[model samples]
Target chain A: SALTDLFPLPIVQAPMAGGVSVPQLAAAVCEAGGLGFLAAGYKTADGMYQEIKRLRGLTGRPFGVNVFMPQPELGAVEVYAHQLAGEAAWYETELGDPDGGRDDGYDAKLAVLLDDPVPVVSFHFGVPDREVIARLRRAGTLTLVTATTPEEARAVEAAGADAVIAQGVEAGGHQGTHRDSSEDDGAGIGLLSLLAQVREAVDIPVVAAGGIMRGGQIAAVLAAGADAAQLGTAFLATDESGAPGPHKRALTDPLFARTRLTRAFTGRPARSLVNRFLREHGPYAPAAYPDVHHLTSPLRKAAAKAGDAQGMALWAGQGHRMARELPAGRLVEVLAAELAEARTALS
Target chain B: SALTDLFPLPIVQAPMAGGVSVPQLAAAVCEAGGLGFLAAGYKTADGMYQEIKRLRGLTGRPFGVNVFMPQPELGAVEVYAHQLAGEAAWYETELGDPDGGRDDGYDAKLAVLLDDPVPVVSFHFGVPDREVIARLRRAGTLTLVTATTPEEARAVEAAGADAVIAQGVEAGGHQGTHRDSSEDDGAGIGLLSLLAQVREAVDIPVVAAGGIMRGGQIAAVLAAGADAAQLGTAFLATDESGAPGPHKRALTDPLFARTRLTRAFTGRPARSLVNRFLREHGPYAPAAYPDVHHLTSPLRKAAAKAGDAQGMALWAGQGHRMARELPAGRLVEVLAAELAEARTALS
Candidate 1:
């Protein structure tokens, strides 16, 4: 398999876009023999390049960078923007312009990776064109596209991605489904069903993501035909993760008992632990991707600064309560040992 | 162990409350070495008693009855009833009365089961009191309770139920979540995560129910700590199944691409194939269960009589397309063989 050819372990640390999956965490995971990743979603080409350099300086093993696909431009978001007026004033920050960065620096970031050649590049939101994927792989990089449905997995495989990352409904952060413009909430498929269907549909290696916290879960997905497992919230509490202290603590806090998929934070549906802000805005939020993402960005930054967990995007998977706090390397080691034990037990 | 003691097979037929789970389906499943079930929810005590008698005469093997717990009464439903005025004219039938059977023959069903006990009895919507469970168990009947959360499973166990059926979010029909009077749609946990959590919380054998279709799915659930796998939609297409022809055909139809949890049909969230009716009424449906369930009952029956699949409650799990058409007994045998092969591959 392409994944195993590059890395010894089947456990992959999911690339979190919001300052969480930094060089320190990725380097630690790579050092521990599992695949690590850096978030290139919200960064400039130079920023991504600098992070990759720093990560390489920290570790010699292979790692991946997750880049966000450029979103289609939306016509208007003034009503949605005005809806956040109360939030801006409350947070003591000016509202971010909704029209900012439609491309999310996608072209520059892709060019940098294409020119320098990284070991791997993963795309989120949507897959790139067949030629784009082919050219990247020609540059000695394995390309991965995140898919939420079997239909999307086929598209990813057809476009010549090295592997398909099957994102399940329980996963934290953004759903990687290509078309999320509708009022549809979930990716609408659980990890087990989604993984099984995706595995049947594609010849490419499948990386299962969502609600995975235990080695037993890793074994379950693997037995169901996933080549590897990717987890986000499980790694959010690791010592090296760049998540805010308040957000880190919220995973264990009884106050935030469950998680909900809300477009309130970013317009694209993402699972976040329940908070006052989500409850207030989730129902009224529309399907306007980066536009909504931009509208709420300043409010989130201010809320994080004030250390109010409820006011920020507390991205979490359903299995968040089971997240264990440790060093990223140590957590990966623990997970590997548990997976071995679980596999033995299943056998 | 208790479940296995009654039936050698780990495949349990889920008791769908409508006419779908009849004597023929249960008897065929029982004859095929699996435990079958009868739905006692919408039937009178005499009707349920007749089903058990018929099922026994057909197989002479163990089977179970699923009874709906009596719901709490609501004060007013005029607004919701008035909202359904368009449906009455559209279906060419007068709307069902808002005030109807409150008990759903719960007391009568319990009395029927307790006086003339069957091998097993399951409760949905809510669990019975400890005394009722103890009384039934004393009469040589094993009690099973459906739980969507670990907290609910704990309550079921504490109430002296024999086992807990962990229903995942991807399950069809009405979610057996006890508290469905809220705006929350799903039980909010998928089968894998919900099963893992419930398994850790209870001492009893766990039966997993959700988007399980193939033998591999059964194997996956078993490996995830489920004592047995209970499937509803998988069995709905069987020859002996009492489900309407259109409902069965809709399972594999490309026209109905996906299933969504909508309260429009029953006013309690249930996963049904997406249709025109769901698109029109799903959003505004209230939390009032049997009241709204009553109001929509006539419209559904009229639609079914007209052979219009889109207008009826086509309850289906996320794995609807995988449903195979076969004899119930044959399907069970195939499932068992598949389960064995899957287990072998995992090992």
Candidate 2:
């Protein structure tokens, strides 16, 4: 609850991995009275340490760091890799050797956070052991876990998470499902229902995430019992975000009209702009997480280099159309102003 | 908006098909100052007419009628039927040859409604053609269409629907996706996000549906921009509801731990209490609606007769746990009181 009270505006800058969420963006949002987050996913301990240091240098305000908890390697990756060979071969021909085998640096990242604690540390994919969470608490760092279902929320609370991020079906990027096999079922509960259900199942503070793009939505979630509203896609277009030019442009592009949950880019379920790759490969992509994530890395990298929106993993929420290109600080301020207006309108 | 203004409380008793939503239930909800609906999905035109007459005789308050728009016969029905033959054989032994070949009497139902127009009419599965909607409009009947996506909401508005019932993924019974192919994609968007997106995309009044069992949830959706909240599972336990004893009992039964969307009982996706049938057949069921609906009818009927919860389609929303066994009038009053309390707390 103190984490919720720390934010003058009930807004949290979602920790988007793969470069979109940066120290500058986090600091700007924090400076504007919202809880900003640095994504520790896809980064090593040193990498995360540098970003955290840079974020601290930019703002003295409170901020959060998100880590992707390690998952057991999925079986049948070899079989899935074989299934993807035809498409993999084509990508390999276009963009030299494929890159794979990454743990997302979970262990090292956790070690860095424990050695030098920040204001907050959140987990995605799954909740860590209770000991890790207890250590963070002892170090004065608040711990949060992303839960897509009420069961997952209860598990996070039992595991000693200081708070739960109720991630709904409408969220973009990889879903923070604790069990990989439960993703299909987890995807069924949307943000509002998930938030309400999670709030009822857990005693800890709840932060709502997914498809929340407007101040009214923020107010709506808060009214529904969410202590704070976490916005990911809404911040993707901000000036301080490290999202690539094409990805940023595609957010408002009419050609990219809708966002859909697909595992074509990553083996895990994620919301993204509907593209040729998703249309062609979404159904065939196995639920193989990092293996699938690694299998497609080369192709995504090439697509990014060539600025081809068709082949890139354009992670975005359902409200991508309304994402603004303002500075992060200005966007936070505007969101706060809009929240006040919405509260007045509702009253 | 005018339709919303007609209700003292922004509650609509969901018109659950398959005999669960009866004339008595509709009349009772209408009498309680909320919109009540008679489902015309699986009945004859004459049957609907008689029920409408009975409902009118029971209550002077305005009520609504819901119809299932006709869908083209799925081509792969033979293949799906072949797959279901094993289960069908077992059901056939219990209840002579499983009933099949039904258009749900769509034409007759439409004719009946036009011949003797009701205060309001709603269509599920998809919106009707412009002419049918126009005819209803001319008859001074307000029309609503159930839409699962923002795109579907736009289509409903474009078809001249007076309002849109935005059905979320957490909703029970059949999903109101317009295109059969879209039913899969439609399952991914949750109630709050879908309602918010639908409200933003269409100018028509939006009624939020799905997992809305409590007054706080109603307030939450209204705050998010829904004009009213439609509740199906919440009313399933009411005294006036026609839900079979086993189905009603399973709703609150601790043994039935969770609700999930499955097509095991009906070819179309529907949320139901977890049971043996769902566990065994859910993965194998196809997306063929009426064909599948007919294929499983015998099994469902026998299951109901035997009061075997495992064999029946126990339709329910996420908030099934909170459903109360009370008179419809009393439930409405309690919900209104809770809504007032929630509003006060938020204020």
Candidate 3:
């Protein structure tokens, strides 16, 4: 893929799901001479295809798309039920309704992607089945799988992934661990350690994610033997992002401490802001994703619309402190400049 | 001084005076193989002399001491009067009377220092007049001056400084900038730029400070031409430091955002945690140093003792997020390991 071709400033703006990852943000990144990724996690196949077309129209430059892989829904179902049962009282008080949630359509989204193709499709959560991956490969899509451990990196290679994104524990958002949620705990390695292990373990290209927001951070990750750097929280503060005012405000909030693996807001383990909602209800929230994700949708939406920071789940990796308030283009500009300078300075 | 000769590691734990820095913390850094400094800003000269003796008895290894140069008292006096009038009203409402407020005995402390010399002495606020510096030098004490700009670097050299600590603008805590505070606003260069500039401008060895906590950060500074790295906030959270419970907690708080320069607490341009105090009082705070400092003393002390974050001025640098809660010696060990690993990996 063109993204893996030249690798000028080996930094990739992370693909944020929801409205946070905007076309303008991605386009600006490419314009600034670093790779940008379009997050296709929530979008339909047609929606993602249109984005690919639009990006082509806007920049005629190389960009990438990230897709969420489908895992067995049974785990999410059980986890959601458990979490809902746990948070019944809090939900009764906050939402005035407890039974308001459902999946946003995972199978349907995947089905559509079988026919419509994007140039690059990176996977999160778990690597897709071999058949689905082979089909995508046949369609000329370069596939990358997110991994948190060495075993996962090996799994991705076996599944025929073009590359592996070593998502460390320091990364924000839903952890890309494939197995049980508990294993993700102590297994969450710092980016430096994770990148080095994955790089040494796999022959495929390794991109590092987690707490990489600054050019110096990028330099550090690359210095750890990463072929590329993938950052998410850093771009959340960019002007083009769909991140709400409160979410954006949270990005600038210096109070961001260490990130923890929580399955409270969404059924899956993800890193987020420690607010009233997460503090009070997260314990009861189940591991069943899309289910609890569905259950929390109305609340998340309401909180976001009202700009209630305490009620929202703000996903941020370890590098949340380095998040900036500049526009995406300007951030990329500064990052590129910093990367060159960091290289010269560090070298 | 013994500190100049026996600093085992290239790292110097900065003396972050005013509650954030503690004696046990400084001693721990020395134990960990790095030199730690005691901030003697608010302490009496007698107290400082006692501490020096205590530390010397505690460990035979060299450590540093940081002192605030005497500033003109006129500004502080005016600010004290204004705040006193306001405090009188508050005192009538809260305690029924307000009377105690005065200078912290700068001359007495200098006399103590002249009488009994410490090994290594670092100056903050500004370099002292030539006579004082020469006397200290003649006493066999090594003097280090904090320089925020290239011109300051030149001045420090001319003032006969042994080394220049290039305190970049991105550094947290009070900026050691000379002259008008507002002039160096956006134009102040970052550590990398400042380090190279100061290195080229001066013949003295440069110690890099500001926003340096991680091993990679230290490596970057060293590569940028700094002789050593001095860190303050990075070591603030260590177990041995005298940081209050909430202050240490605030360092790791995810809610902690970027630092802002404000004189709301001390009445001089200084960096602090942007909170309700900064929001309400920053604009109204006077620019008088010790006067404003003395006037706000009661309020600050009361707030700090009570753990009222909204009222206390929390000082930190850009790298506060990376601050770890461990022993200072462990920090030095980890930092050195990380730096060596990063250097090898990148090379």
Candidate 4:
């Protein structure tokens, strides 16, 4: 529980990958007395190290870094690639060459973190082995792993995680289901149920994540047994976030009415605003992760460049409509005040 | 909120179809001070009337009756039948036949309810037309409809439903999604999150449903803003429940460790104990309802008679392991005590 004791408030700016999480956003949240995170995903080891240094220069407060754990490549990548080649050809007219290989740089990232330790480090997609976790612990780092089920939480605890982030089905972006069986079932346990189940199943502190948009939800989850709350979509529209203009706009756009879980964009299940690409490809998308992820990258980039809301991968939680475009620090202050107001009202 | 004041306890013994919600079970729950329900899904109009009379003879306390709304036959049933013929023939060797027609007796059952009104009437599968809801209201029956999303909750309110039963993904049994898009997405919203969203969406009282097996979960949902908690699987093992011996045994059996949503037994999505049937046919089951439901009925009956756990459709919530085998009235008393204990602990 002392892991959350470092913060004045038990709120975490959830680490969102693909450039949404940056040094400025992390530093701003840290400055506001909440734990902030620099996303180490989609970045080289040196790139992550540079961002950590930048964040350290901006805020003396404690911060965390989130990295994606490496996964074994499935043998179906070639078949999945063949399935997407037709769609890839169509989008290639507007965006050339949808060819990208997968190497998430897990080894380089772990080496960087071990050489230059931060206050905290969190892993997603899968839990690292015991030896890797022990190295981080020995480096004076508090470790966390994202778990979508009680079984996964137990696995994380067994692997020596300091805490587990109970990621609910309502969460935005890629789900943190165990990489080996990510597609076992489509039913993701909800946050409150998952939080309670995970708390009972494991001894470590549980951080609640998914569809958490307001202070009341934060207080609710804490009362329901979470040690802290991690919010990703709530921070997407913040001024310091690195989300693209279209992605930020879609969060508040009336046209984007609902959020749905789809594997079309990345081959792994993720919550996002319904778009033309998802509507067409979601059913046909394969279970191959990085392969499918890279296959759709060109179209997503083209859509972003063209300011087309219908083609972009706009990751968001179910509470996307409530997202506010404010300074990161100011948003944190508002959340804290709202949390107090809600708790007082309940009392 | 006064809508729930009709009962002493803000708990509703959820109506379980397929012979589980018997007259004795509903009467016992009502006698115990919680609201009770008689399921009219698979029963005839005369049969439902006789059961209502039987329940009235057993207890004078207020109780409700639940009915399934009718759905138009899908064109895919024929194609789905072709796909299932081979499996159906295989089961036919053990089970007599797999030929059952779809007539849920919606009209006759509605006629009976109109002639002999109950204290409460609820609809599942989907909300009925406005006039149908109006007729029930005119008959002095408090009306409720099951909703899986906030939009569905809003629609229920617009259809003049007096209250909304917010069903979550974790709840056992068939999902009560809107018929037009029942199979649109397999991921149903989680209960606690859905409850919060539904509460914010409608002005009427909200009754939380799904995976609520413990008194603490009941207390948690109520505190999160549900006017009451509705439980189905919790009552499956009660003395008065009509569940078969094998079905009851499966609820607490260590062999049945987890519950999964499979459309194998019923064409529509439903949560059940993972069995050989699910393992073999779950992935290929089509998006057809009664057709699929009827197609697998004979196989289920044969499996039940043979005491074969792996072939039956064993409906249960995620909290199946915690189910108790007690008299219905005593079970209610136990839940009430546990709720009080939880509230005191929180205080």
Candidate 5:
């Protein structure tokens, strides 16, 4: 397999953005023999570089980093802005500028990675063009693009990706369908179905993501033909995770019953816990990427600061009920041990 | 496991109604060392008994039968009736009587099963009461109920069901969420995610269904904690299957590329190939089972008679593209072989 030389263990810590992927968590996972990932999203290229320099001192093992692709399309979100007026008053914060989608320093991030390459690089929100992928491969970086559907995966395969992450319906955060099917629910294919079709469609290695909370699930994905498994929600409650205290506490809370794909937090569709903010405003939200993302950014920050779990973005997978609080390094070792036991027991 | 004594193999031919799960396919599956199933849905109690009598001659092996619970709720479907007037003209068929949702003879079906009990009896659309289940158990019938969510599985478990079928989003035909969340897509949980929650929610054994077409998929589900795996769309193309020719042809056709849950076909949500009728008239259809079912019943029959696949219900799972044309017995054997190899290789 292409990743065997790079990743001795079939475990990859998902690169969740928005400050969740702290350098310490990534370094801890790498020291435990799995590929750890840092999120470059919402960070300046300089900020990303600073983290890479800090991580070098913590662990010498290989690691990966993720960048959010630029969203070019903008929607008519004036109604959405007006709808959030009451929430602004309640949170005691003014709504931020909806800057019609920004570039998020994509070019600078790419240049930094090209100059000082990581073991792997992944793209979310959308796929980079073939030229960008070839450039990364030339720089000795393994490229992984997130795909929600098989067609999106085929598009990534054609765009010269070394591997594709099959994001199932149970996945948390923004769904990485290249073209957002914002009009309906056609894009929410399950991991098993998506993984099977993706493996049949392309020859690239697949890293199965979503609803994978246990060791037996990793064995199940391996049996279903996934080369590796990437998990985000499972690691959200770990001690080293930089997720806000309220966000970590809500993972084990009973009030947030289930997870749903709501555009209330960000303009694009993303899965999050069924919270008050999403329940109240999710329906009125229009499909705009950074526009909606920016509009609600201040409100989320205020809610997190206030320790109000009801008002913040509580991102989680369908298996959120099974989340455990532990150390990042210990979680990886426990996962590996469980994987071995499950595989041996199955036969 | 409870079913190990009854079923030597892990494969179960799913009970699909509407002339698809005929006597022959179920018999063949039973002969091939798997538990075969018959659909008592859309069949009279006497008609169901006749099939059971007929099947006794085909094979002396054990099998299962499924019945649909009566839907008491009827909607104001006059607008939907007017909406279907155009499809009625296009198909050259008159709309049938709505009659405010029929019983589907659920009472008589339960009585017949109790009087002349089969080896196994399953319920769909809703679950029967504990009293009914206990009666069936006394009659030596193992009870199974279909559940689309964990709460539904818990409800079935409390009702004394011998096992619960965790029907995932990729499953074809009708999904069996007890209280239909028809207002949105909340019930569309995937198999792996749904199986994990359902198994944790209930102490009873679980049979995994949805997007299951291959031997490795069976092994995957088993590894994921499912006691047995049930397949519906995989057997739809088999020689013994009684599905319409156009339906079978559309399984391998590139035109019917994917499957979606639409209320247009049967009033309640059902997963079928994206056809002309679903795309054009699905939005106008209301969520009234058997009423909407009866309204479109005649049109579906006409479309099938004319071999026009566009208007008829071409039910299928997400893995429809992987369907193989073969005999039902041989398909089961091949699945078992693949399951064996996958399980062995994993360890």
Candidate 6:
């Protein structure tokens, strides 16, 4: 409810990891009447605190801070073993290393959050256990859970989530599906179904997620029963986003087509542009997530640095075509204006 | 009920006039288990009959035949005069004719339908009165009316429509929002909202229309209570479609971002590629239906012929990125497979 109340424009700029979510971007979005989140995914506790302090100096308005929750490793031994074998050639070609997987910052990230709490913290992958949830609640932070189905939303509600994010399967990046990588069936729901069904099943505020990129779309979601709308791809091409030049360029490319849920780069079911790498590796990528994520880091970084779209995992949503290459503030303003005009037209 | 029973696949290859919709394409869609419509918009009775015979030879499966219903001639003299005046320069620059409004054989085409009934006949622009509806009904042809709102749907139903196509506001190309040019507020429901609301209000089978291009989108529409899905832009890029190269290319172009409802091209609320022609002249374009449509005809034709994207009225839907360049039959097959997969996954 606090998240819903904070959104004067009923729009939320996704807490993008990488470099897309920045203080200026968040502040600009907030100034335009939408809530912007600062991503603490890769930052240290001191780094996150410094950014928050910078945001406070930049804009007096309240914004959100999203952090990836720590989870037990899946320990995907066989899948990882097979993938490492297949990726050895490419890894050697790109990173000069064929066998490597020992870099996880889970403890470091968790310690950062524990040391310095923020006003809002949204979790992905899986909801934290009771003690962690209670600790965030005690810190005067609102907790939001992303769910792709009614069952997942219920689980979030039972886990003491302050609100539920009905993340449709069409969302960009990794799916918040609770099931394992092998269990792909019933992994997600569309935004329309997710919003309607989740609203019916939950008494708390329902924030619509996935594929929403424009004003008419934002209005349509609200009319469909969502209290707020969240978007990531729409913000990826914005001026302050961490998305690289080539990634941002591809966002508005004609060949972007449809987004596929692939784990090739991050070893998670994140949506990305269809390219040679994803085509060749997605099906064979391991379910070991951070393990594979760790193993492929150098190669991914190399690909991005090389400006090779075909080799890089370009994350995007179904509404990839509508992603604008404007400043985040301008993007929010256009969206807000379009939404108001759309609502008036509906009336 | 009859249309739904006749058209099994949620996909509908929309009739794009001016050499866009073809018999081979229609046959391929029907063969793939999706309904397809032959464009009888600009053909003579003999030509239409020959096309039908050709289609019959290609596929014995059921397919639809769409005819653009005749509307009253543009009545607003001053607005029509202004649009004509504005387009005269472009027409002179291209076709060597400032005004070219030829009746490309509507009467003759109607006679062919009157004499030889098809399995399915859909009406666009405005539905024929009750007598014409009864005549089609008596002829054993399943009649569908493209209605943009509940009111229009109710009217078509009252006029004995076998099924109502809830063509939402987001629909690409020409809108079927019963309201005439000048009074049209460009207000109408989206596919999901229109289908659900119409299903609650009417007992007739509702075919959801608008930007439905993806397999997941088709599943979402059906799950929202639509008996079937009617798609246009989704099929525009298929191999069998006759869309000019630029038009086809624009469907998947990211720069063509948001689709706006404008009457600049056809003097009807139609969605099109964001172009300079519409931007410069849309506001002043008259709402005089055919007259304004005639006024801009030559300019659009020349622009399309030259493969100039900025001048062409590249009609498309919100789901443009999901449109694939596969053959119509393959597009249909993939969608069918996806729908089955989605349902099985859900179950």
By lDDT, rank the candidates, best first: 1, 5, 2, 4, 6, 3
DockQ of each: 0.50, 0.46, 0.06, 0.29, 0.65, 0.03
Instruction: Write the residue-wise lDDT of candidate 2 on B35-132 in tens digits.
Output: 99998878888888989999999988888999888778644556656666666576654322223544578888888888888999999988899999
How many residue-pair clashes does candidate 1 contain? 0
Candidate with better TM-score, 5 vs 6: 5
- Per-residue lDDT of model 6, residues A1-347, tens digit only: 57666557789888887777889888888888888889876566667777888888888776887776554545454555455554456545433222332222545655655676666778777776877778878877788878876768888888988888888766778787765455452234446645655765778777788877767667656655567888888998888887888888887687765457777777668888777778787767766565556566667677787787777778887667667888889999898887776555443
**TM-scores, all models, native as reference:** 0.97, 0.92, 0.54, 0.89, 0.96, 0.54
Considering DockQ, which of the candidate structures 1 and 5 is the better prediction for this target?
A: 5
Residue A38 alpha-carbon offset, candidate 2, angstroms: 0.4
Error of 2 at A64 (Å): 0.6
lDDT, candidate 5, at B230: 95
- Across A1-347, the per-residue lDDT of candidate 1 in tens digits comes to 87768888889999998899999999999999888999998889999999999999999999999999988876346777788889988998888888788787988998899999888899998989899998898899999999998999999999999999998888889889888866456426988888878888899999999988887788778877888999899999999999999999999898987988889999889999989999898888888888888888999999999999979999998888888999999999999898887767766
How far does residue A236 in candidate 2 sit from its true spot (Å)? Answer: 1.1
Candidate 5 per-residue C-alpha lDDT over B1-347 given as tens digits, one digit per residue, 9 for 90 to 100: 76747878999999988888888999999999998999999999888988888888898888999998888765457788888899899888899888744678888888888888899999998899899999999999999999988889999999999999999988888888785655446547878888888888999999999999888888888878888999999999999999999999999899988778888877888888999999887867788778888888999999999999999998999889999999999999999998998898786
lDDT computed for candidate 3: 0.71
Question: How large a fraction of the reference contact set does each model reproduce?
Answer: 0.28, 0.42, 0.11, 0.14, 0.54, 0.01
Span of 10 residues, lowest total lDDT, candidate 4 chain B: B93-102
The lowest-lDDT stretch of 10 consecutive residues in candidate 2 chain B is B93-102
Residue A316 in candidate 4, Cα distance off native in Å: 2.2
Residue B123, candidate 2: how far off, in angstroms?
A: 1.2
**Considering summed lDDT, which 10 consecutive residues are worst modelled in model 2 chain A?**
A93-102
Tens digits of per-residue lDDT, candidate 5, A1-347, equal 77746766789899878899889999988998888889998899999999888888898998999999987854367889899999899999988889844778999999999998888899998899899999999999999999987788999999999999999988888788776655446547888888888888889899999988887788888888889999899888899899998888887788876888888888778889888998899877888778888999999988988999888888898888888899989999898987887787787
Per-residue lDDT value at B296 in model 6? 68
Interface RMSD of each: 1.8, 2.4, 11.0, 3.0, 1.3, 14.0
Give the docking tier of candidate 6. Answer: incorrect
Report how far residue B324 has shifted in candidate 1, in Å.
Answer: 0.8
Per-residue lDDT tens digits for candidate 1, residues B185-265, read 532787888887887889899999998887877877777788899999999999999999999999999999898998888
What is the per-residue lDDT of model 2 for residues A206-248, given as tens digits with 9 covering 90 to 100?
9999988888788778777888999999999999999999999
What lDDT tens digits, residue by residue, belong to model 4 across residues A100-195? Answer: 445578888898899988999999988899999999999999999999988899999999989999998888898898763444556577776687
